[PDB]
Amino acid sequence: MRVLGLNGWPRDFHDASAALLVDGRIAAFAEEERFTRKKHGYNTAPVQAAAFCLAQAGLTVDDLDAVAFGWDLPAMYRERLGGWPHSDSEALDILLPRDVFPRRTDPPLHFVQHHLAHAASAYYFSGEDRGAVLIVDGQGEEECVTLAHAEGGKITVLDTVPGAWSLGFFYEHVSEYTGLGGDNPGKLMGLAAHGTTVDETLSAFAFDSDGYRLNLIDPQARDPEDWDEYSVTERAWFAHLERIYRLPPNEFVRRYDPAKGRVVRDTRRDPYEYRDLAATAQAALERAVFGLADSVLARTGERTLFVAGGVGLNATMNGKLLTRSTVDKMFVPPVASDIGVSLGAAAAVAVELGDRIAPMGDTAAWGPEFSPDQVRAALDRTGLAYREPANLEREVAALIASGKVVGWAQGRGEVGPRALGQRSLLGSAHSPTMRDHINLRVKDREWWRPFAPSMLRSVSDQVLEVDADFPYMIMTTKVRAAYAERLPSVVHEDWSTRPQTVTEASNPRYHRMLTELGDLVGDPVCLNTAFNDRGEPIVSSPADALLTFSRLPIDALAVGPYLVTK
Ligand SMILES: Nc1ncnc2c1ncn2[C@@H]1O[C@H](COP(=O)(O)OP(=O)(O)O)[C@@H](O)[C@H]1O
Ligand SMILES: [Fe+2]
Ligand SMILES: [K+]
């Protein structure tokens, strides 16, 4: 079967994406934002991403067996908006506009419950036949947590937690409160590391062996003037935090900056000031989630844990789950967030149609790639001088070993928020100055942001305490003592790191470059951070890569078989 899975809608939506499954395999998968260059893919059908998927596979909508959407959108309209006005034909015209998606007839349209879509995106791609399912996000249609059992191809729901008790909303709100912003929860996690926790209940949470309770909010609290509990939870958490925390909300400042020639948005206070609140929010999230995970594992009698939902992006939390006595094996897909529900909806529908779903297999490289001709065209546009190195991987290795920063745009763009050797900025893992260089000099951002390493799978056993695959940078683990001081730019003081393990199959070129690097500095390990400028998504096209390379003090750009230097 050929099934196109979708997420993103013109009203009140985020993280639009499209995914095409062909006989259980990911033919193509991408986020709208990569194409629009507007972060988070807000308020839009995944028009461009779906266009890419079809082009990639050489299909039209007429070749599709089914279109799948990762929310029960009709039910949300019926419940929260007084009616679902669309025929399937009309919904399709909105999801796949005819001026972009010509069709003789309509494919069967499927709506998949939001948390089932999340769960499917983990279970079916994990390479494991059974496990316990833990979905934690902001909110699906109703619930904010789902506990389920995955076995024999089936996902069976055991329990849910209602939206008002959302751990995702809680976290966003704290992130917003600190001035980091609700749209950047990942920064809050980064900041938590520098703080100290006093009272992990925040005077709101009560914890138990199966999870948590939120006394701050009626669990059945509901917004009659919207279709999720975001605003209701926002007002409760903001009143509460101002009451118990020493600092009031950090305020956003909008002012004309004569250096930039623009009104820019800033914060009234340095958010580093809220590090204790971050630390505390992070401890609370961990505690709540440990209980939930323990609970679903015991109830199902599994020792494999699947996690998805936006909270699943909390790599710090994931790593501690991993080391938990109740967990043997863990799988969290790179696309744990809503970007993943397109793929999840496609899977749930393809499985329903008798398809067998292949494992992701240690790669998230499903987006667009570009031929040498296509890269060369973009280079000739700029008029910039460039070389075509006989051995690019070796030259890149030497650049990195010497302490230089190298843009690396190769192969199919990765999907998800993490750069993984297709659209990365590369630098020395061994350099005790590289972190400040990239944070301050290169990305002109916060000194306290952490960096993470890519390493050959074939050495990770010696480098890391756990001999497992870590293909996605979605899970933190500790390094072994023989490496806990060798890699200062990618390893914290507590010896923790958020690694990508690389196999030769998953990424031959990158694997080769890492190999060369190893001969130069001993360890086939580098710093691998997102290839983007503040306020843009990861670069996608060669023109994107050139544009960003041009405005950042990077040393080189390896784009396709070409090298460009500054
Ligand atoms: N690193 C992180 N740590 C904790 N929570 C996170 C992190 N990244 C995302 N989230 C949470 O995921 C939530 C949204 O998840 P998602 O499933 O993508 O959308 P929705 O909740 O609308 O279905 C946000 O409220 C956010 O707090
Ligand atoms: Fe979600
Ligand atoms: K364990």
Side-chain angles (χ1 to χ4, degrees):
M1 299 302 187
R2 302 152 169 159
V3 176
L4 181 64
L6 303 178
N7 182 57
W9 185 251
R11 69 173 289 162
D12 298 335
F13 253 75
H14 62 89
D15 292 295
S17 65
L20 180 54
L21 295 178
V22 176
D23 299 323
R25 311 205 163 256
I26 302 171
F29 182 15
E31 306 160 66
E32 196 62 6
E33 70 163 17
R34 301 303 215 275
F35 305 96
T36 62
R37 311 309 302 158
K38 301 179 195 180
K39 293 198 65 181
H40 301 320
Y42 292 120
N43 295 333
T44 181
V47 178
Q48 298 209 49
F52 152 72
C53 286
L54 296 185
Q56 173 66 18
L59 305 182
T60 73
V61 166
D62 292 316
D63 301 313
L64 296 180
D65 292 288
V67 164
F69 192 81
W71 291 75
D72 191 338
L73 195 54
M76 303 163 67
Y77 268 79
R78 269 153 198 154
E79 191 71 358
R80 315 297 290 258
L81 298 161
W84 169 248
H86 302 304
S87 69
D88 282 5
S89 192
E90 291 153 354
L92 281 162
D93 281 338
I94 288 155
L95 288 170
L96 302 171
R98 279 175 188 272
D99 64 341
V100 183
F101 299 99
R103 58 183 194 266
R104 300 160 173 81
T105 68
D106 294 315
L109 184 64
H110 298 254
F111 295 96
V112 177
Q113 299 296 308
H114 187 60
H115 282 201
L116 181 51
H118 274 312
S121 76
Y123 182 31
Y124 299 119
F125 300 89
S126 66
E128 302 279 345
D129 40 310
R130 70 196 291 119
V133 171
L134 175 65
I135 306 309
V136 185
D137 66 351
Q139 183 173 9
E141 302 89 357
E142 302 178 52
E143 67 278 15
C144 73
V145 178
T146 285
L147 313 175
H149 196 174
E151 67 187 315
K154 289 156 300 169
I155 302 179
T156 300
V157 175
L158 302 193
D159 262 322
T160 58
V161 183
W165 281 12
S166 170
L167 296 172
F169 288 171
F170 155 64
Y171 209 74
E172 267 186 71
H173 297 328
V174 169
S175 194
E176 179 81 355
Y177 190 97
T178 67
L180 294 167
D183 50 330
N184 299 292
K187 287 170 148 198
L188 188 71
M189 181 177 75
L191 182 57
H194 301 257
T196 289
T197 291
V198 217
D199 168 17
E200 57 187 34
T201 70
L202 281 155
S203 303
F205 288 103
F207 308 106
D208 60 73
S209 47
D210 306 287
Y212 67 99
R213 284 182 159 85
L214 211 38
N215 302 309
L216 184 62
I217 309 184
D218 192 289
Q220 303 307 340
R222 163 160 151 162
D223 206 332
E225 287 319 328
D226 206 327
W227 71 356
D228 65 30
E229 282 38 278
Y230 193 89
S231 295
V232 145
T233 59
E234 180 172 56
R235 290 194 306 269
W237 279 106
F238 265 66
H240 181 74
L241 299 172
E242 187 174 330
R243 192 175 73 69
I244 69 168
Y245 187 64
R246 56 179 184 92
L247 301 175
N250 194 358
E251 281 181 282
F252 295 97
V253 177
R254 284 175 76 200
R255 285 183 85 190
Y256 181 79
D257 181 349
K260 306 283 179 70
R262 309 192 185 184
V263 179
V264 306
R265 170 219 209 43
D266 206 343
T267 55
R268 203 56 173 89
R269 299 171 132 104
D270 178 356
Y272 186 75
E273 286 206 63
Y274 297 71
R275 59 195 183 282
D276 285 341
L277 179 57
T280 307
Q282 177 66 34
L285 186 78
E286 294 174 350
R287 189 93 138 76
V289 172
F290 297 160
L292 299 167
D294 285 349
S295 192
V296 66
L297 289 160
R299 291 181 69 170
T300 61
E302 304 292 353
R303 296 191 54 83
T304 286
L305 180 65
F306 303 127
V307 174
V311 172
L313 284 165
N314 196 291
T316 295
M317 181 197 71
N318 289 338
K320 298 176 186 179
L321 276 166
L322 183 63
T323 56
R324 212 159 168 79
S325 63
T326 42
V327 181
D328 285 334
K329 303 208 236 76
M330 196 161 164
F331 180 82
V332 193
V335 298
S337 75
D338 283 4
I339 69 175
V341 300
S342 47
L343 178 79
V349 168
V351 165
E352 190 170 271
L353 295 176
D355 279 5
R356 193 168 304 111
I357 308 304
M360 277 176 193
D362 324 315
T363 185
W366 301 302
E369 76 186 313
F370 301 81
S371 74
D373 288 12
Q374 284 159 344
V375 177
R376 187 169 69 260
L379 289 171
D380 293 337
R381 269 309 286 152
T382 70
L384 290 172
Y386 62 89
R387 296 176 48 233
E388 179 172 5
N391 191 335
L392 180 61
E393 299 85 328
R394 170 170 300 143
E395 292 196 27
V396 173
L399 289 173
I400 294 165
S402 83
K404 284 165 187 179
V405 179
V406 187
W408 172 274
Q410 305 289 319
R412 306 264 303 268
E414 57 280 270
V415 178
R418 297 283 86 76
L420 294 169
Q422 319 285 353
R423 303 293 190 281
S424 298
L425 282 175
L426 306 176
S428 178
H430 299 83
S431 168
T433 54
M434 185 60 61
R435 180 176 165 157
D436 284 341
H437 176 68
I438 301 179
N439 280 329
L440 310 170
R441 173 52 178 161
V442 172
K443 299 185 158 196
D444 181 27
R445 73 183 188 177
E446 302 98 340
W447 66 268
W448 53 259
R449 309 277 293 275
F451 294 105
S454 287
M455 75 188 73
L456 296 184
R457 179 61 178 96
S458 72
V459 299
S460 79
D461 187 28
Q462 308 148 236
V463 179
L464 309 175
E465 276 166 13
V466 191
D467 179 36
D469 291 286
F470 293 95
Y472 308 118
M473 274 179 180
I474 197 154
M475 199 164 302
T476 297
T477 171
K478 288 173 76 160
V479 315
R480 294 185 168 274
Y483 292 90
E485 288 182 27
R486 287 187 66 69
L487 308 168
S489 68
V490 294
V491 174
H492 302 263
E493 292 199 356
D494 65 17
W495 293 12
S496 69
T497 205
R498 192 205 62 188
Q500 180 201 18
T501 52
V502 179
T503 67
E504 195 286 327
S506 81
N507 197 340
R509 239 136 127 74
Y510 197 42
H511 180 275
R512 205 170 308 122
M513 184 287 294
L514 284 173
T515 294
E516 289 291 345
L517 182 52
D519 293 334
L520 295 190
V521 302
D523 316 304
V525 184
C526 71
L527 180 156
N528 152 42
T529 191
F531 193 167
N532 68 277
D533 195 15
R534 278 184 309 108
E536 80 174 331
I538 285 163
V539 305
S540 187
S541 70
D544 293 345
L546 289 159
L547 192 78
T548 295
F549 166 70
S550 280
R551 69 169 131 202
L552 302 182
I554 297 174
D555 305 283
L557 169 60
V559 64
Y562 306 115
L563 194 63
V564 192
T565 60
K566 287 206 196 204

Short mmCIF file of all heavy atoms in Angstrom, two decimals, residues 321-325 327-328, ligand 3:
data_model
loop_
_atom_site.label_atom_id
_atom_site.label_comp_id
_atom_site.label_asym_id
_atom_site.label_seq_id
_atom_site.Cartn_x
_atom_site.Cartn_y
_atom_site.Cartn_z
N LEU A 321 15.08 7.62 32.41
CA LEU A 321 14.17 6.51 32.17
C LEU A 321 14.98 5.29 31.78
O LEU A 321 14.77 4.18 32.29
CB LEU A 321 13.18 6.85 31.05
CG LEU A 321 11.97 7.63 31.55
CD1 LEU A 321 11.17 8.27 30.41
CD2 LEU A 321 11.11 6.71 32.37
N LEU A 322 15.93 5.50 30.88
CA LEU A 322 16.74 4.41 30.36
C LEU A 322 17.43 3.67 31.50
O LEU A 322 17.48 2.46 31.48
CB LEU A 322 17.79 4.92 29.39
CG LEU A 322 18.61 3.78 28.78
CD1 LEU A 322 17.67 2.89 27.97
CD2 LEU A 322 19.75 4.30 27.93
N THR A 323 17.96 4.40 32.48
CA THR A 323 18.76 3.76 33.52
C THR A 323 17.90 3.21 34.63
O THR A 323 18.40 2.65 35.60
CB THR A 323 19.82 4.71 34.12
OG1 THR A 323 19.19 5.89 34.64
CG2 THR A 323 20.85 5.07 33.07
N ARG A 324 16.59 3.34 34.47
CA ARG A 324 15.67 2.93 35.50
C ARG A 324 15.60 1.41 35.61
O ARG A 324 15.64 0.71 34.61
CB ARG A 324 14.29 3.52 35.22
CG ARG A 324 13.50 3.82 36.44
CD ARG A 324 12.43 4.83 36.15
NE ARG A 324 11.51 4.88 37.26
CZ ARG A 324 11.75 5.54 38.39
NH1 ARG A 324 12.89 6.21 38.53
NH2 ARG A 324 10.85 5.52 39.37
N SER A 325 15.49 0.90 36.83
CA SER A 325 15.47 -0.55 37.04
C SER A 325 14.29 -1.23 36.32
O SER A 325 14.36 -2.41 35.98
CB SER A 325 15.44 -0.88 38.55
OG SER A 325 14.26 -0.39 39.17
N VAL A 327 13.10 -0.58 33.34
CA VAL A 327 13.18 -0.48 31.89
C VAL A 327 14.37 -1.28 31.39
O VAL A 327 15.45 -1.11 31.90
CB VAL A 327 13.40 0.99 31.45
CG1 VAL A 327 13.45 1.09 29.93
CG2 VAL A 327 12.32 1.93 32.02
N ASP A 328 14.20 -2.14 30.40
CA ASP A 328 15.37 -2.78 29.80
C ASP A 328 15.73 -2.09 28.49
O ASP A 328 16.88 -1.73 28.26
CB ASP A 328 15.11 -4.25 29.53
CG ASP A 328 15.16 -5.09 30.79
OD1 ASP A 328 15.85 -4.68 31.75
OD2 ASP A 328 14.51 -6.15 30.82
K K B 3 18.09 -0.26 32.96
#
